[PDB]
Amino acid sequence: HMSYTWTGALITPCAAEESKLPINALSNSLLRHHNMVYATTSRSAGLRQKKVTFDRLQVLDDHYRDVLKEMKAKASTVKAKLLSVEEACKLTPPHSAKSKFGYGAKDVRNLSSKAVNHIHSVWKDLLEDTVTPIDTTIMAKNEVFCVQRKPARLIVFPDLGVRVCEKMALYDVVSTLPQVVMGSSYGFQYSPGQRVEFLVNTWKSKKNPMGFSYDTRCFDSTVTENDIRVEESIYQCCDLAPEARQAIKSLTERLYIGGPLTNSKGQNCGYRRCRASGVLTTSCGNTLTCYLKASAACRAAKLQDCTMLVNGDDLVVICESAGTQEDAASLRVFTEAMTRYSAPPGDPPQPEYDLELITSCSSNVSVAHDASGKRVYYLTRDPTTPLARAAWETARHTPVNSWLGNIIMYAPTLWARMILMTHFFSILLAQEQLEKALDCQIYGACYSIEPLDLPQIIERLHGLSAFSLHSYSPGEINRVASCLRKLGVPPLRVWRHRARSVRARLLSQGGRAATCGKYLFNWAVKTKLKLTPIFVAGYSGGDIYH
Ligand SMILES: COC1=NC(=O)C(c2cc(C(C)(C)C)c(OC)c3cc(-c4ccc(NS(C)(=O)=O)cc4)cnc23)=CC1
Numbered sequence: 001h002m003s004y005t006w007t008g009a010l011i012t013p014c015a016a017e018e019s020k021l022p023i024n025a026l027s028n029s030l031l032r033h034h035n036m037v038y039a040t041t042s043r044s045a046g047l048r049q050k051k052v053t054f055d056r057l058q059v060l061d062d063h064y065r066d067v068l069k070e071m072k073a074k075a076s077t078v079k080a081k082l083l084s085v086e087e088a089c090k091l092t093p094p095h096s097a098k099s100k101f102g103y104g105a106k107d108v109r110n111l112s113s114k115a116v117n118h119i120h121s122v123w124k125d126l127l128e129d130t131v132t133p134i135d136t137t138i139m140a141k142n143e144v145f146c147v148q149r150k151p152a153r154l155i156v157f158p159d160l161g162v163r164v165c166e167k168m169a170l171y172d173v174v175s176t177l178p179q180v181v182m183g184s185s186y187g188f189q190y191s192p193g194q195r196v197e198f199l200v201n202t203w204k205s206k207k208n209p210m211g212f213s214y215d216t217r218c219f220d221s222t223v224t225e226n227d228i229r230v231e232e233s234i235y236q237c238c239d240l241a242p243e244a245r246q247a248i249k250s251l252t253e254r255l256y257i258g259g260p261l262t263n264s265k266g267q268n269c270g271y272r273r274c275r276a277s278g279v280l281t282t283s284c285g286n287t288l289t290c291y292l293k294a295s296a297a298c299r300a301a302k303l304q305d306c307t308m309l310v311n312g313d314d315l316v317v318i319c320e321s322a323g324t325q326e327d328a329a330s331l332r333v334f335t336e337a338m339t340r341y342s343a344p345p346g347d348p349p350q351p352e353y354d355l356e357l358i359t360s361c362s363s364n365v366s367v368a369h370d371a372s373g374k375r376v377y378y379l380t381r382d383p384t385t386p387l388a389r390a391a392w393e394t395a396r397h398t399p400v401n402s403w404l405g406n407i408i409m410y411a412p413t414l415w416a417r418m419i420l421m422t423h424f425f426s427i428l429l430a431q432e433q434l435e436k437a438l439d440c441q442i443y444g445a446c447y448s449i450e451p452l453d454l455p456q457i458i459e460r461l462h463g464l465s466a467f468s469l470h471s472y473s474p475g476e477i478n479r480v481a482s483c484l485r486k487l488g489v490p491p492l493r494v495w496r497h498r499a500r501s502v503r504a505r506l507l508s509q510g511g512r513a514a515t516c517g518k519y520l521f522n523w524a525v526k527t528k529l530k531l532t533p534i535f536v537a538g539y540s541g542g543d544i545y546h
């Protein structure tokens with residue numbers, strides 16, 4: 001039961017690949033230590049192949065089937081609708097991978113006869129064929145990081161035509177099922193603001209709180225045939241159209257369980273026997289399989305009052321502490337159970353006795369103060385990776401504007417407000433690309449956002465408080481400061497001086513730009529202004545556009 005079998009054919013790119021940070025005129029106003037920032041390519045694919053290739057041994061006990069029986073009971077109350085070709089076509093990202101059968105994502109979005117005719121033949125094939133493995137494409141992702149050098153992550157996806165079919169069979173499923181089965185444990189339903197409220201209320205609900213996070217060493221590669229069939233059986237509990245059931249069974253058997261891996265150049269690289277990173281059910285499947293293994297492992301560990309928060313492969317549990325030694329013991333039992341279930345860790349979990357110390361989805365809770373001086377909890381993260389990607393997006397146009405997603409998801413943070421908002425707003429002013437809508441990614445889902453609508457969007461995700469936050473924790477201040485030192489980012493005082501200019505330039509433009517300057521940059525001025533008023537699921541790898 002190997003996660004992958006290989007032939008020897010290399011994972012090849014489509015176009016030109018850049019590993020070194022591209023430098024332009026705006027580069028130095030953000031980052032000086034350019035050699036620190038790199039992007040991954042198909043060059044490092046071989047190392048990834050080695051890492052992701054291992055044999056999986058599973059030992060399923062009564063807690064596992066007990067939890068599963070509960071999940072299947074909740075899943076049977078779900079009703080899911082079969083999407084139409086048109087409905088599925090409209091949920092396709094505009095810069096999604098083109099089909100091998102002619103047409104592209106925009107052809108799809110325009111409901112073009114060539115595309116719609118092809119989508120109709122794939123659907124017919126799924127309904128009349130449940131054995132033939134569906135061909136997938138293996139590709140190295142091009143992602144930006146800071147040093148300490150990671151090998152390129154892999155993306156395995158079926159043809160665009162198959163992807164519109166997955167949308168027809170499972171879009172309403174992956175959207176409604178995780179919330180029913182897992183309830184408040186399902187994280188992809190929360191805004192960052194509601195994610196905080198949940199965590200804080202959870203920590204406050206425990207007498208002696210204890211929290212930990214669980215990082216699976218390459219989760220996708222640990223997902224076995226069993227796990228994918230289990231997922232299908234969960235989906236099959238729903239009230240589904242007969243066409244949908246059949247389509248789910250064929251997509252599972254032919255695509256989701258495994259299949260052959262093809263490079264961009266058309267060769268066979270090998271065979272997959274685990275989770276495909278670029279399928280509609282990647283997020284949902286991973287969330288179900290993580291929650292199923294962790295809930296069962298919580299019971300195996302006899303963990304008092306387990307409160308989970310699962311997002312794909314990221315797990316955060318908050319429970320009742322039994323002292324640092326018994327808690328350390330319990331987590332070993334948990335890690336033993338998780339490994340038996342074929343979900344071992346990279347770094348084994350550590351008990352945390354302070355909410356602000358648990359690392360949930362590369363983020364953590366932190367405290368600052370509002371206008372009234374009231375202690376306010378918000379979500380932040382290490383600015384290293386966001387700032388390194390921001391540097392890439394200063395000289396290169398990407399299909400995903402990470403700086404835009406980082407401004408959205410981390411709006412009340414010190415770093416996103418001071419550096420990211422300032423830098424990119426001066427760029428948008430200079431180019432007059434302020435009214436131009438930009439494509440970004442949130443929870444793995446593709447979004448087209450008008451940058452001038454940012455104060456409206458931020459208020460709706462965090463509240464007016466995000467525009468009034470101050471007096472940040474010294475632990476947070478120091479993480480940012482040390483990061484600014486690492487990458488060679490100008491200090492915060494430089495950014496406050498720059499934000500005054502951005503704000504002054506923004507008021508002069510009037511309209512939404514004046515609101516942008518008034519709400520986003522109010523923190524920079526010595527004469528403050530009275531700021532007034534103006535989430536369902538995660539689709540990581542799912543190929544979804546809203
Ligand atoms: C640059 O654009 C950004 N867009 C985003 O959506 C976020 C973001 C933020 C957060 C918060 C803690 C701030 C709420 C996340 O946690 C829920 C997020 C969790 C994820 C996430 C994605 C995939 C998976 N699991 S998987 C690999 O597919 O199996 C698990 C979690 C993605 N983005 C998250 C940050 C930056």
Ligand SMILES: [Zn+2]
Nearest residue numbers: 062063065066
């Ligand atoms: Zn039992």
